[PDB]
Write a protein that binds this ligand. Sequence first.
Ligand SMILES: *[C@@H]1O[C@H](CO)[C@@H](O[C@@H]2O[C@H](CO)[C@@H](O[C@@H]3O[C@H](CO[C@H]4O[C@H](CO)[C@@H](O)[C@H](O)[C@@H]4O)[C@@H](O)[C@H](O[C@H]4O[C@H](CO)[C@@H](O)[C@H](O)[C@@H]4O)[C@@H]3O)[C@H](O)[C@H]2NC(C)=O)[C@H](O)[C@H]1NC(C)=O
Ligand SMILES: *[C@@H]1O[C@H](CO)[C@@H](O[C@@H]2O[C@H](CO)[C@@H](O)[C@H](O)[C@H]2NC(C)=O)[C@H](O)[C@H]1NC(C)=O
Ligand SMILES: *[C@@H]1O[C@H](CO)[C@@H](O)[C@H](O)[C@H]1NC(C)=O
Ligand SMILES: *[C@H]1O[C@@H](C(=O)O)[C@@H](O)[C@H](O)[C@H]1F
Ligand SMILES: [Cl-]
Length: 595
Amino acid sequence: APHLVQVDAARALWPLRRFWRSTGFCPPYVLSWDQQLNLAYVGAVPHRGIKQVRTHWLLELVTTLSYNFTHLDGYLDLLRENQLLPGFELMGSASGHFTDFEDKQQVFEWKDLVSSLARRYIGRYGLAHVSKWNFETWNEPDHHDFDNVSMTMQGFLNYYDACSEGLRAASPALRLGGPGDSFHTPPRSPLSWGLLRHCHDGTNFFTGEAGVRLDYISLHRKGARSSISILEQEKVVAQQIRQLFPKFADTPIYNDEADPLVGWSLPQPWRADVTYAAMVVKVIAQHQNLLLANTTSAFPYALLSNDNAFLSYHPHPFAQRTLTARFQVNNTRPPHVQLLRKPVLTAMGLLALLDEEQLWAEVSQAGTVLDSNHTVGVLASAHRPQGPADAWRAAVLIYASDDTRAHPNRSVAVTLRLRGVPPGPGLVYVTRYLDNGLCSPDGEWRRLGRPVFPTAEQFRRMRAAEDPVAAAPRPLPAGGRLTLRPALRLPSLLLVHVCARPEKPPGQVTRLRALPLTQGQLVLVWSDEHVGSKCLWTYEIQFSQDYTPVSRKPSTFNLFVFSPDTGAVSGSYRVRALDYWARPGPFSDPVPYLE
Ligand SMILES: *[C@@H]1O[C@H](CO)[C@@H](O[C@@H]2O[C@H](CO)[C@@H](O[C@@H]3O[C@H](CO[C@H]4O[C@H](CO)[C@@H](O)[C@H](O)[C@@H]4O)[C@@H](O)[C@H](O[C@H]4O[C@H](CO)[C@@H](O)[C@H](O)[C@@H]4O)[C@@H]3O)[C@H](O)[C@H]2NC(C)=O)[C@H](O)[C@H]1NC(C)=O
Ligand SMILES: *[C@@H]1O[C@H](CO)[C@@H](O[C@@H]2O[C@H](CO)[C@@H](O)[C@H](O)[C@H]2NC(C)=O)[C@H](O)[C@H]1NC(C)=O
Ligand SMILES: *[C@@H]1O[C@H](CO)[C@@H](O)[C@H](O)[C@H]1NC(C)=O
Ligand SMILES: *[C@H]1O[C@@H](C(=O)O)[C@@H](O)[C@H](O)[C@H]1F
Ligand SMILES: [Cl-]
């Protein structure tokens, strides 16, 4: 019996916040051409789809009393150029200087370093920007990952106070949280539990005042291949914090490594394709629907981060927990690195289209109501018109996902009944579909026979599988109703996008950049910040040598790899948006390129 998915576009229940717009990684590097490409891919997720990059060991990018900030400046500029913020973990020894946080002198020095770096980047980017940064404590303090630094219980509290008093010294507007660990039942996790007691009831290292600032509480909970287990584990912890620390009952909780399975480098076939993509979407749906959908317990859960910005290595280009697939092509003159968009990265661009209010939704099978704790589920959103640039939007994201297990033979029959769409001018809809047969770069890589150093043409075919299957805009049926009975694969993802026609056309594409890969091969990347409407069909790219359109299958990801047969890449490039009504926006500033 089929699954019935019902959506009411007239019932905007509560706000829908995009709490999942984060990623992260750990160095083994951060300034290599590889990472430059990686963060361009991350940054290219449309409509600020990924906003934060939680990066380990940022204070090893500073050397030593004065400090050389050159490398840290490097990484942060790279983030800033890709429209990304750092998950700023105050993590490092400043290249050997710091060794003991029970040494009074060093605690004071840590405070002054924190103030220096904070003030430096406030000066570099503006306070309006640096306030948004989630400054965080050292990663997993209960997991002994300190190198040559002695971090005892007392030392951790001293360290935190230096962190907090240092950031305050820069500006009181700066945000700081922690501990960024798992919070196991005591006597376990003593520095995680110790921190909250310290902030709640302890005395500041510097002021002697009772209690210390703690702007958010971050935990790490993974699901060991189960999706709903993540959410189940968070509730146990959140509720324990609520009862043990009453002052933190409203304190935001982050899970800033909420991954399906611990151990990023462990090769997993499901990490390669839509199996991973759909599970991430399922996890997010579970968190919205079974935690933030005006529940009677309503914990202040504010951030979820899939820690998947790592670069993959040989011989597992797809099988690791990464957003991109890396190919180091060692047999060209000279050796060069290529990246492919994994289905999970494309999934983040689909989650990106969800707007500011959740609509009423219900999944049922033969009259039995099913919540997101099932193989099939939905997220739905509505948008309130802002200016003449945008209109009313509906985003309906349906997943089929059995967690880390895929089912190639199964065809999940789904019937979608959309109702109560507020009437308006030019009501059209567009579908975008993803599965392992149609949209798996990995699977194409395998049809090609697993080429270790893929040729240009092999990459072209491999990239063809990146984007979802899109259907051209069709007018909405009368009465603001739409019924569709698609057959879904397992895993699969389906976005239905219903848009009303805005008064003005799309805005101007901005911050266009050209990035070299190898001979006759280049990455074009851009920003959609001034386009000011999510109802977009494709981005038109034009090339002039002394302007003709570059013909390509429709895509709304803010990154394109230009690899023509001729090899003629030298010239000028311009880019503009094209909406669902074929109305073009103004072309971006031309970007010159020579080889
Ligand atoms: C084309 O050329 C590039 C260089 O430009 C080669 O890239 C190297 O590829 C190998 C992978 O095959 C890399 O070596 C592997 O690195 C992994 C990560 O290492 C870091 O992290 C660990 C733990 O945190 C540290 O021990 C280590 O010091 C690093 O900081 C390791 O996990 C791997 O070890 C595992 O696999 C090997 C098999 O090779 C086993 O022997 C081990 O027991 C273990 O299970 C591994 O060492 C290497 O880092 C890459 N270098 C660069 C610069 O990227 C490509 O390999 C080459 N292409 C081909 C086809 O040869
Ligand atoms: C999500 O669903 C799973 C299974 O559908 C639930 O796990 C079951 O819970 C009951 C009651 O606690 C146990 O007796 C069973 O052993 C569990 N079944 C299986 C197959 O593991 C789980 O409790 C649900 N969680 C939420 C948050 O809805
Ligand atoms: C800091 O270090 C960088 C890279 O190691 C080096 O090139 C530079 O000379 C140093 N800068 C200053 C201002 O000392
Ligand atoms: C949390 O867990 C690690 C892992 O799963 O391998 C990584 O995601 C991160 O470095 C760590 F913070
Ligand atoms: Cl994982």
